[PDB]
Symmetry: D2
Subunit: 462 residues, 4 copies
Amino acid sequence: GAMNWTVDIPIDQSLPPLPTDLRTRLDAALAKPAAQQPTWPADQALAMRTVLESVPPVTVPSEIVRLQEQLAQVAKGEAFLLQGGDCAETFMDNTEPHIRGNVRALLQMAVVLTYGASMPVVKVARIAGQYAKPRSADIDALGLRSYRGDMINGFAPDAAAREHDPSRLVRAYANASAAMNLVRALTSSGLASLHLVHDWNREFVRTSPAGARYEALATEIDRGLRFMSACGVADRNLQTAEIYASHEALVLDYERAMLRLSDGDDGEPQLFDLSAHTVWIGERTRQIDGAHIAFAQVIANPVGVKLGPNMTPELAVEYVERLDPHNKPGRLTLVSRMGNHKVRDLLPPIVEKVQATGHQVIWQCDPMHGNTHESSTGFKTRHFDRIVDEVQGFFEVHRALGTHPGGIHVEITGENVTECLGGAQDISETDLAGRYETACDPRLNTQQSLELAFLVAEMLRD
Amino acid sequence: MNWTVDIPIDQLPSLPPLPTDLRTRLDAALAKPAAQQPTWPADQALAMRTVLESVPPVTVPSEIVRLQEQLAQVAKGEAFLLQGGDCAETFMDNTEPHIRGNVRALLQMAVVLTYGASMPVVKVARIAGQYAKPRSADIDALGLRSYRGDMINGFAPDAAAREHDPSRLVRAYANASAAMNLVRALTSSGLASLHLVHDWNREFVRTSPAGARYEALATEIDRGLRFMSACGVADRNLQTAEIYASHEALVLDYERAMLRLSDGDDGEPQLFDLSAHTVWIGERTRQIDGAHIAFAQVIANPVGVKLGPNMTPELAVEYVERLDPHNKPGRLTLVSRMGNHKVRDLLPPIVEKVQATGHQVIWQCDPMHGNTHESSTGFKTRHFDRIVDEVQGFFEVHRALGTHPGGIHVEITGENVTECLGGAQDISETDLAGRYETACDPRLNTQQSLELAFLVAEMLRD
Amino acid sequence: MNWTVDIPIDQLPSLPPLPTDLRTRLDAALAKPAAQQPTWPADQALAMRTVLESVPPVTVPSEIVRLQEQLAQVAKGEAFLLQGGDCAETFMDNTEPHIRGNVRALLQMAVVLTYGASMPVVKVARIAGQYAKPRSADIDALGLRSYRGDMINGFAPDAAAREHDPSRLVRAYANASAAMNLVRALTSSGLASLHLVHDWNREFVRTSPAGARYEALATEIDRGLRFMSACGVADRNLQTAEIYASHEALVLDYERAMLRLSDGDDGEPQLFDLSAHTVWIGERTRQIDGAHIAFAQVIANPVGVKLGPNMTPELAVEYVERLDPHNKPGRLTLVSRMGNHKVRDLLPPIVEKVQATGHQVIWQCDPMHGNTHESSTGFKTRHFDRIVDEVQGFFEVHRALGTHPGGIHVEITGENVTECLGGAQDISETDLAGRYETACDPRLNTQQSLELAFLVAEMLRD
Amino acid sequence: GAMNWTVDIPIDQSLPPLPTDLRTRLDAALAKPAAQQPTWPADQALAMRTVLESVPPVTVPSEIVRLQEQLAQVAKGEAFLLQGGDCAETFMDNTEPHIRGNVRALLQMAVVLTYGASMPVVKVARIAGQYAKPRSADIDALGLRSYRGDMINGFAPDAAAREHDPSRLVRAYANASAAMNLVRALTSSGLASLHLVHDWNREFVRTSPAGARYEALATEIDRGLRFMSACGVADRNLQTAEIYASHEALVLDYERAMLRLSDGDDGEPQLFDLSAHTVWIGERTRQIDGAHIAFAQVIANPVGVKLGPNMTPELAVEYVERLDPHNKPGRLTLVSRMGNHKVRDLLPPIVEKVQATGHQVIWQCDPMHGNTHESSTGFKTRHFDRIVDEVQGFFEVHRALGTHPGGIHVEITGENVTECLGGAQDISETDLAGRYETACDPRLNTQQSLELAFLVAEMLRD
Ligand SMILES: N[C@@H](Cc1c[nH]c2ccccc12)C(=O)O
Ligand SMILES: N[C@@H](Cc1c[nH]c2ccccc12)C(=O)O
Ligand SMILES: N[C@@H](Cc1c[nH]c2ccccc12)C(=O)O
Ligand SMILES: N[C@@H](Cc1c[nH]c2ccccc12)C(=O)O
Ligand SMILES: N[C@@H](Cc1c[nH]c2ccccc12)C(=O)O
Ligand SMILES: N[C@@H](Cc1c[nH]c2ccccc12)C(=O)O
Ligand SMILES: N[C@@H](Cc1c[nH]c2ccccc12)C(=O)O
Ligand SMILES: N[C@@H](Cc1c[nH]c2ccccc12)C(=O)O
Ligand SMILES: N[C@@H](Cc1c[nH]c2ccccc12)C(=O)O
Ligand SMILES: N[C@@H](Cc1c[nH]c2ccccc12)C(=O)O
Ligand SMILES: [Cl-]
Ligand SMILES: [Cl-]
Ligand SMILES: [Mn+2]
Ligand SMILES: [Mn+2]
C-alpha cells in the first residue's frame, strides 16, 4: 500500500492451452542455455510471469504483420529502416517530455532520410521496453553488482539497489504500456505532421553552428514538401506516421510472459511476442544453440541479430537459415557493428555469402556499438566522426557489391546531452561532464542525431 | 505467503509545477466541498498525487480539441453521440479479451446507428478510468464498508479489502493507460474495419432469436456498404475509427493529479484533464457550488452532467451558465436519466428552458440509470423494454420541440452476461443467476446492446 | 437562295500512312463482301476517307484499354454494363440540351442500377456516331429510297435529300467530335455528380404516377448515399463518372478511315477504331464471312454482336472463336434480342454452348429490338411491359444457369417523347401522336427509362 | 457535297430569349465601334452565326467558374499562371500529332514551373480557337490583302484565298471543338501523368546542348517527385491535369454566336462565352469605349487585356474599373508586353497605380510580342535572350514592389521549328530557313520553351 510505496497485486483468480506443437517448441527453446539472465528466485519469477500473462499487450499481431510487410520492402531495396532511441530507457525518465523528445528526434531524422533515400522510411523506436542490458562483468568498477537495466535492478550505486528484483518485470510492463500509449497518441494526433516536423528541422538549420553546411539540403526538402501541396496531394498521409516499438529481447522471463497466440483468422495460429513489434538478439546472447536464437525461431515477429567483428560468413548464413527458414523477405535483419576502421574489410565477405543463399535480409548498420572508447575525463564516449565513418564504410561496402544498404540503428535522444564527442557543437572531453545522463551507453544528442541524418542522406543521394 | 505481490513505486523526477496563476485558480475551486470522496489520509493522497503528476498522460490535448470539434457537430444536429461500456471497470477484468469485446460491442452499435442516423457517430467508450463510484450508504448488506470501485477499494467482501487505499490511484492509472494503449492499437490496426464489424452484425442477425425482425435493416446496411465499393470510394476511412475514453470524474485526487497544461502552439495553453477525453459529473456530486462542478469549470475537456427526475429547469440553466460560459457548442452535454414512465413529462420543460438561453448543449439520453429495479431472485436488474421505452420517449420529446436528440449513454459489455431482463433472448429472473458479473449496475449484454442499436436506428429513421 | 450553306473542306496535310503489314491485313479483311453499304462513288468515298484519316480522333487508345479492363470485370461477374441512348442520332438534334438530357437519363439509370447491382456500372452511351442504319427494303412507303441515317442521307422525304452523299462522312465526324467534347465536359465538370443525379431521381419519385411504388427503393438509395458522407469517405469519385461512346459499326468507309495505330508505350502498337470506344455489329451485317465481322477481328476495341431469334448455339460459338481468339474476357459481348415471349426458350442453349468454350463473354440483354410492333394509329412502337418482361426472362435464364446477366442495351432519351406504349404514364396509342420524334425506332422516354432502371434494380436484388 | 469539296448545312429548322437586361447590354456593347473586324456580308455572317448558336459549346459554364476560382488564387499570390501555344492555329495543322505536341510542351513547362514556384500552376493553352489575328496594314508586303487567320481567310499567297469568307466561322468552330475533344481526352487518359511528363523533361536534359546547365534543377525535381511516393501520397491527382482553352477574342461575329446563358442554379443567369474558358483583348482592339472591351464587360469569363509600351497608369486603372467592377480577384488579368529594354521602366508606375485601387488583378508577362525584329535573311524573328530578359525584368519589377509576378504568356510549339533565334541550340539567322512554319509570329520551339521554363523557375526560386 501507500505506506510502503507499493501497489499490491493479486496473482490467483485462466489461460488457454497452446497448440501442442507450439508448447513443445517453446519448451524446447527455453530449455536451452541462456546467457545474461537475472538471478532471481524461480518461484518469484513465476508469480510475476503469471501477472504479465494476463495484462493487455503492448502491441497486437496485425501491427506486427503490417510491420513485416513494410520490412519486406526494405529487404527488397524499396524502403529504408531507421531505428533509434535510448540505449537504456529508465523508469525515472519515462515521462511525457522525454518520450515526446525522443519521438520528435526520430521523426526529424526520418524526414531527412525519407527525402535522401527517395523511398519510404520504416521508423522503429528503441522504446517501450528497452529496460534490460547484458554485461561482460558481473562486478562493475565500483565493486557493485553490475546494473543490468531497470527491468532487473537499480542504477543507483548501492548494493541493495543492485539486487535482482523480479517485481521489476511488472514494472517494465507498466512503464512500457504507458509509453506506448503516448507514442500512439502523439503520432496520430499531430506530433508526426510532416510539416511540423520539418519546421523543427528548419529551426535546427537556422541555429546550428554548421547550419550553413546543411542549408542547401534543408531548402531542397522544403521545396519538395511544397511541391506536394502545389500538386494538390498534400493529404491525410502527411499528418501522421507509424512509429514501431523495439527492444533487445534479453530477459526471457519477460518475453515469454508477453507471448500471445494469434486468432488464426489469417493463417494458422502462431506465437507473437507482444511486448514489442520487433526485437533483436545482441552479441552476448546470440549463441547459435542458445535459448535466445531458439526463442526467436518460435515467434512470428520480425527479428534482428547483431553481428560484431568476430562474425564469419558461415555463421551468418547459419543465422539466416535458422531464423528465415521460409525465405520471407524482411523476417530477418542483420545488424552491422564492426567499428569504422573494420567495416570496409569485415562486412563484404559476410554480405556476399548471405546474398548467395537467395534469402533477402535487411542489412542494417549499427555504427555506435563498435566505436566506443573511454575519455581521459573518465566517461564512456564515442566520436561522432567515427560513427559517421562507419555508416560511410557500410554504404561503400554495399555500393561495391550492388546490395541494398537497408538502414541504420542508432542510440539517440531528443535531449541536449553531452555524451558523444564532436558534431557541429564540437562536444569536448571537458564538455562531457555537463549533461552526461545516459544510464548506459553514450547517445547522440538531438542535434548530433539530426546532423547524422543529414550526412547519411548525402550518402543515400551519392 | 498470501497470494499478492507488492510492486514498488517511488522514483519521482522533478517536473516543473503547473503555472502559479492556474494553480491559484485551481486551489480556489477545490476549496469547495466535495461529496463522496475517499477517506484516506491526506499525506498519503499527496504522495500518490505527486506520482501521478509526472506520469505520461492517458490522452493528449489535441485529441480533446478534436473531440470538441466533433461534439460541436453533434450539438448542431449534424452528428450523433454514442457512449457506452461497463458500469464499473475492474482491475482483474482489464484484460485483452474483455477490452476487445467491449470495443467490438460499441463498434457494432455504431455501424447500425451511423446508418440509421445518416450522419457521423462520435464513439466514446466508458473505459480506461471508470474505476470509482458513489454510494448511498456507508454500510452494505454484509455489514461492510461499501465497495467504491477499484480506484478506492476492493470488491471482495472482506474488511481489509474495503479500506480506502490510495495506492489504488496509481494502480488505476497503470490499468487505464494499458487499456487505452490497447484501444488505440485495436482501432488503428483492424478491429474497427467497417466491413469486419458489419460481418459480426450479419452473424447476429443470422443467429438471434429475433433476427428476422432485424434482417431488413441489416440487409439495407449491407447494401449501403456495397454501394460504397460500387462507387469506388477511397476506402481508407472505412478501415479505422476513433474511440474516445470517458469516465465519471469522481475522485478529485485522481483527476487533479492528471491535470496538464497544453503547449503554446494550439491557441495558447489551457488546463486539460488528461486521464480521459471527456468526463461527466454524476447525480450525487453535481452540487452547483461543490468542487466537482467547479473542477469541470476549470478544465478545457468537454463535460457532461447527469440530470435525474429531481432536476428543475432553473438548475439546468445554472449548469449551462457555469459550465458553458463562453457559449461553445458541444462543450456541455446534459444527460437525461428520468425513467421511461417519467421522461415524456419531466424532460420538455428542462429542454425549453435550456434552449432559450441561446447555448447549444448536447441532449443525451441515459436510459438505464433511472430504470433499475430489484428482481424476486435478489438481483439488481433492468428491463430491456423499459430501457428502449425511455429512448423512445426521449426521441418524442425532441421531435415535439424541434430539438436534436443528440445521443445515448448506455452500460454494455461484449460479454454474454445475464444482467438485464428481456431482449430477444428473453432473459428471465431465473436466468440472471447464470452470468451476473457486473461489479455495479446491470449491463446490456452484447446481443442486447446490438438489438438496442437496431431499435434506436428505427427511431432515428422515423 | 435556298436555306443551306456550303462549308468548304479540303486542306489535307500529309500524315504518314498506317504500317504496310497492318494495311496488308486490313485490305485482305475488307475484300470480304459488306452488306448494307452506301452506294456512293468510290472516288468520292476515297477522297472523304482521306480527309478523315488525318483528323483528331474522337477517342484515344488508353481510354479503350481502360474500358477493356472494366469490361473484363463485367465478364467475370463483378460489374454490370449499361448501354443506352438514341436509336438514331441526327445532325439537327445534336444540340447541347439534347445531349445533356441523354447523358442525364443514362446517369439516372446508372445510380439506381449501381445500387441495385451492388457493383460498378460501366456506362456506355449510344452517342457521338450512331448516324447510320440498315434497311430491309430499298424503297419506303413514300416511294423514296430509304433513309439510312445522317451519315448516308437525309431524313426529309425528298429525292434529293435521299441520295447517298459521302460529304456526310465528314459532317458525321464533326458532329461526333463536337458531341464527345461536350460529353467529356459535362461528365467532368458536374453533371455526373452522384448527389445531383440522385436529386433528379428523387424528383421523379415525387412526381411520377407510380412514385409510390419506387419510393422505398429510392429512400434506401438516399440513405446509402448519406451513409457515405456519414462514414467520411473521400468523396472525389462521387463528383464525376465515365461515359463511353459506342455505335453500330456499319459504314465501313467511316470506320476504316477512323483507324489509328496506338503508340509503342502501351504494350506495343495495335489498330484501334477511334471513332468510338466500343462498337457492335448488327443483325443484318454479322455474316460470319462478311467484312463487318472481319473488321471487328482486326481492331483492338471491345466489340459486341447482336443475336436475334434465328441464332444457333453453333454460330454463336463461331463468333466467339473469330472475335475472341485470345480469350480476353470482356473483349466480346453477345447481345441477346429475342423478344420477351422467346427469350426464356431460345437463350439457354446459346449460353450453355458458349460457356462450354472456356471463353468469358459479356451477356447483355437488348430488350427493345425484338419487341417492336405497329400501332393501329400507324406508329412503330414497343410496349413497356414487353421490354421489362424480356429483361426479366433474361435474368431467369442466367439465374438458372449460374451465369452472369451482364448488362442491358436500351434505346432511351432524356426527352419527354411518346414513342413506347405503357410505363407509369400509361402512354396510349392515341398519345403516340403527341411527341413521336425518333428518326428510327421508338425510344423509352426519360421517365420510362428511369422506371425500367428501378424494375431492373429489383431483378438484380432478387 | 463531295464533288464540290463542301459540306451542306441547313440553317432554318429555336432560341430562348435573353433576359431583357442582358439583351440590352449585349446590343449596346456590339453597337460600339469595333476594330479589326472582317469585311464580309452581313447576311452571310448572320446565317453562319445562326448555325453556331445551336452547336454544342466548346466549354461549359461550370468549368469557367472553376477556372475563375483557380485564377483568384493566382491573383492572391498563391498560384502561378502559365499560358501558351501557337501564335496562330491553322486548320491544316489541327492534327493529333500537332495538338498532342503542343499539349506536351505546355505540360513539360508546367512541371518545371510548379516546382520552381512551389505552388499550383494554372495551365491555359492558346488552342481550340486561336484562329484570328489583327493586322496593322490591310495590304501585306506582297500586295495581297493581309492574312488575318483561318477564321477569316487563307494563308496562301493568292488573292482569291485572301478574300474574307464567312464559312470560316463554322470551320473555326468544327476545328476548335475537335481539338478540345482531344485535349480533354489526352489530359484525362495519361498524357498529363506527372511521372510521364517529367520523364520527357529528363530526356531533354540528357540530350540538350545545355543540359548540364539544367541538370541540377532537373534532379531536384525528380527527387521531389520521388519524395511524394516515399511519403505515400503518389495519388490520383498526379495522373491528370486540367488544360484550359484560350484565345484572343477578336472576331465578334464568332464570339457573339458562341454566347450561352447559364442555368441560374448558382446565382442569377449570366452570359458566358463558350468558345473558350478565358479570352483576352489585344493591343489593337482594346479601345476603352470600343466593342471588345464592352463585350468583355458583359461575359462572365475571366478576361485579360494586353498592355503595351504606350499604356498609362491611369488608363490601366480605367480597364480595371470597367472590367473588374465587383472586385473579384482573378476576373481580370493585365498582360505585360513592353519589350525587354523597357519593362523595368514602364511597368512599375502601372503596377503601383493599379495596386492602390484595392483590386487584385493577375500580372502576367508576355515577353515575346514586344521583342520581335526582322532577320537579315528576311524572317520575322525574336531573340531568346530578349525574351528571357523581359521575364527577368518583370520579376525585378514585382520583387521591388512586393507584388506577385503572376504568370507568363508565351507563343510555343511542341514542334522542332526554327523560328526564334538563340537558345541552347543556338538557332542562327541561316538556321531560320530550315523549319519556319508559323502562320504568324515566331514561336519558341519545344526545347526553347522548356529551357525558358527552367530559367523562369530560377527566377521564381530567387
Ligand atoms: N515511471 C515511474 C512512474 C510510474 C509509477 N507507476 C507507473 C505505472 C505506469 C507507468 C508509470 C508509472 C515509476 O515506474 O516509478
Ligand atoms: N506518413 C508518411 C509521411 C510522413 C508523415 N509524417 C512524417 C514524419 C517523418 C517522415 C515522414 C512522414 C510516412 O510515414 O513516410
Ligand atoms: N507464457 C507461457 C506459454 C503459454 C501458455 N499458454 C499460452 C497462450 C498464449 C501464449 C503463450 C502461452 C510460458 O512462458 O510457458
Ligand atoms: N489488471 C491487473 C494486472 C496488472 C497489474 N499491473 C498492471 C499494470 C497495468 C495493467 C494491468 C496490470 C491488476 O491491476 O492487478
Ligand atoms: N471512420 C468512419 C467509418 C467507420 C470505420 N469503422 C467503423 C465502425 C463503426 C462505424 C463507423 C466506422 C467512422 O468512424 O464513422
Ligand atoms: N449539327 C448541325 C450544326 C453543325 C454544323 N456543323 C457542325 C459541326 C459540328 C457540330 C455541329 C455542327 C449540323 O450538322 O448541321
Ligand atoms: N464515379 C462512380 C460514382 C458516380 C459518380 N457519378 C455517378 C452517376 C451515376 C452512377 C455512379 C456515379 C461511378 O462511376 O460508379
Ligand atoms: N482541319 C481540317 C480537317 C477537317 C475537315 N472537317 C473537319 C471538321 C472538324 C475537325 C476537323 C476537320 C479542315 O478543317 O479542313
Ligand atoms: N494535377 C496536378 C499535378 C500534375 C499532374 N500532371 C501534371 C503535369 C504538369 C504539372 C503538374 C501536374 C496539377 O495539375 O498541378
Ligand atoms: N447570339 C445572340 C444573343 C442571344 C440571343 N439569345 C441568346 C441565348 C443565349 C445566349 C445568347 C443569346 C446575338 O448575337 O445577338
Ligand atoms: Cl500450454
Ligand atoms: Cl434575345
Ligand atoms: Mn451504472
Ligand atoms: Mn434501334
